Amino acid sequence: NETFEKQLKDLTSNVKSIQDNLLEEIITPDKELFKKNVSYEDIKPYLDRVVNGESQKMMPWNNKYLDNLTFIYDLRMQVITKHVKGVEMMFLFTKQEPARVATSSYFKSDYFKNRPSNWYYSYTSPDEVILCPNNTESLYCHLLCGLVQRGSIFASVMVRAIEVLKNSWEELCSNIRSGHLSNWVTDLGCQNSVSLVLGGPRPELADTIEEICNQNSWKGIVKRLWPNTKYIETVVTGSMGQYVPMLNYYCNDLPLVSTTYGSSETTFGINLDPLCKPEDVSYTFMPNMSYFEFIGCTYAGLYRMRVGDIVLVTGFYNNAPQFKFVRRENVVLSIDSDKTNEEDLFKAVSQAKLVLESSGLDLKDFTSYADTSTFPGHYVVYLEVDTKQFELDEEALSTCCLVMEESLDNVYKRCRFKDGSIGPLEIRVVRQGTFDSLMDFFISQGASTGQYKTPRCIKSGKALQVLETCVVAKFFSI
Numbered sequence: 001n002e003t004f005e006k007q008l009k010d011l012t013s014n015v016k017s018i019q020d021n022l023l024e025e026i027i028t029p030d031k032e033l034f035k036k037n038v039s040y041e042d043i044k045p046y047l048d049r050v051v052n053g054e055s056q057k058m059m060p061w062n063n064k065y066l067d068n069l070t071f072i073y074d075l076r077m078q079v080i081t082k083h084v085k086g087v088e089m090m091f092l093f094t095k096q097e098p099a100r101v102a103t104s105s106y107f108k109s110d111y112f113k114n115r116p117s118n119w120y121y122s123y124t125s126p127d128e129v130i131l132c133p134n135n136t137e138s139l140y141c142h143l144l145c146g147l148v149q150r151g152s153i154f155a156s157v158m159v160r161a162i163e164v165l166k167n168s169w170e171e172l173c174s175n176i177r178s179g180h181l182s183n184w185v186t187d188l189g190c191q192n193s194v195s196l197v198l199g200g201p202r203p204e205l206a207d208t209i210e211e212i213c214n215q216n217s218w219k220g221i222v223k224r225l226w227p228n229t230k231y232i233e234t235v236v237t238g239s240m241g242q243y244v245p246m247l248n249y250y251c252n253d254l255p256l257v258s259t260t261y262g263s264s265e266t267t268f269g270i271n272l273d274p275l276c277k278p279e280d281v282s283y284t285f286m287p288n289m290s291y292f293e294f295i296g297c298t299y300a301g302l303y304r305m306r307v308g309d310i311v312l313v314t315g316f317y318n319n320a321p322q323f324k325f326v327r328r329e330n331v332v333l334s335i336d337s338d339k340t341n342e343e344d345l346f347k348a349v350s351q352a353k354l355v356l357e358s359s360g361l362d363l364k365d366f367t368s369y370a371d372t373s374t375f376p377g378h379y380v381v382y383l384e385v386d387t388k389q390f391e392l393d394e395e396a397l398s399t400c401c402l403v404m405e406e407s408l409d410n411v412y413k414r415c416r417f418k419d420g421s422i423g424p425l426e427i428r429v430v431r432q433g434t435f436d437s438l439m440d441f442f443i444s445q446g447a448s449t450g451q452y453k454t455p456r457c458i459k460s461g462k463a464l465q466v467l468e469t470c471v472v473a474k475f476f477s478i
């Protein structure tokens with residue numbers, strides 16, 4: 001609207017002045033002297049000092065979601081309201097926690113309950129289902145309410161949300177008839193609210209659902225159940241890019257839209273161009289939460305903190321700069337004097353999936369592990385493949401083994417070829433739904449549901465045998 005456009009204009013130019021005002025509002029409870037004056041691994045001795053007892057520098061936690069997330073949600077609501085019409089069922093999760101937790105700090109906060117409710121903040125899933133500590137029951141509640149409906153934080157969850165429906169349909173069909181939530185749903189909120197949603201039986205929808213679901217092709221399925229949905233909202237940037245092409249098969253190729261970029265430290269900014277395809281999607285940063293200041297180059301509670309993620313400038317309106325996410329620092333694979341990171345992995349798997357694509361297969365998911373047990377220590381990748389023992393092509397993936405190697409840095413290839421520090425790259429083929437079972441492992445181990453993204457390197461190593469157990473075959477380079 002006029003007000004939204006006006007505000008968006010007021011955010012320009014935010015480069016220095018407004019960011020310095022926010023910096024002053026921060027500091028008080030000039031900027032040159034601060035710059036001449038002013039990581040969590042570094043802050044760990046300093047940050048853990050305030051946790052010294054339970055059952056104090058600053059006041060935890062008024063930061064972030066209070067003054068940040070609601071603003072973002074509303075503004076992006078108005079953005080998609082501007083770029084899309086007719087919009088005037090999302091998957092989010094909370095688990096049992098006095099500590100900062102995921103986006104669940106928002107769901108546990110009164111900014112969520114006192115949230116303005118119009119459309120964007122209105123959902124088909126009962127709010128009791130959202131906060132439900134049982135995410136397995138609450139997911140089924142989301143999918144049942146959806147089955148009756150007439151995106152998420154991360155993309156990695158979305159496919160799983162598609163996965164469950166693949167293994168379960170008719171149970172929902174019996175549930176809508178019974179008017180009761182499934183007997184194995186133990187949550188009071190889920191049970192009650194969902195039973196209320198079901199209410200009277202609806203065989204009319206049940207039969208046509210049964211007719212629609214049985215189709216032999218999974219191509220573009222999710223778009224059929226709710227055609228009126230214009231767009232998907234999930235992060236397709238970063239590692240989550242891995243999940244892009246799979247959706248387009250499962251969907252009608254409706255737009256995949258990444259609205260926001262933020263970390264545990266704070267929320268950074270939002271994407272101002274919904275017209276951006278997943279690869280060019282760019283996050284422009286907000287001045288109010290801004291620190292580290294600002295300006296085609298490579299680059300409250302926290303002052304001059306180092307974020308720990310890598311971004312590049314995708315361009316600008318010249319009023320404010322735009323940024324696309326590339327890689328994250330923390331994840332790295334190494335043997336001797338060789339650092340291989342997220343974007344090198346993505347490079348290699350991009351080189352690899354083009355080989356699989358020619359053989360009549362594809363790649364559902366991947367992750368990595370380095371084996372230091374035996375010399376030479378070699379790079380190991382775990383692949384889960386889909387056809388759109390049984391059907392094994394020795395050549396395709398043994399080609400995929402090599403095609404990843406020369407895609408990586410010559411550093412690796414120095415320790416690989418000539419000097420023998422590392423041996424031939426190994427690919428492990430895992431059976432169906434292995435990565436599904438693997439994410440089930442993490443959640444139960446104290447990992448957020450539901451904040452979930454698939455790690456591309458495994459240090460655990462308690463999760464390692466889970467992939468090992470499911471390996472169908474192994475293939476090597478050279």
Ligand SMILES: Nc1ncnc2c1ncn2[C@@H]1O[C@H](COP(=O)(O)CP(=O)(O)OP(=O)(O)O)[C@@H](O)[C@H]1O
Binds near residue numbers: 237262
């Ligand atoms: N849209 C996006 N694209 C790419 N990366 C993102 C992103 N949004 C958030 N992130 C990254 O993901 C992190 C948010 O949660 P986490 O991934 O669990 C932090 P982490 O340090 O990678 O976890 P770890 O230290 O346990 O491995 C932020 O550090 C941020 O760098």
Ligand SMILES: [Mn+2]
Binds near residue numbers: 328
């Ligand atoms: Mn990360």
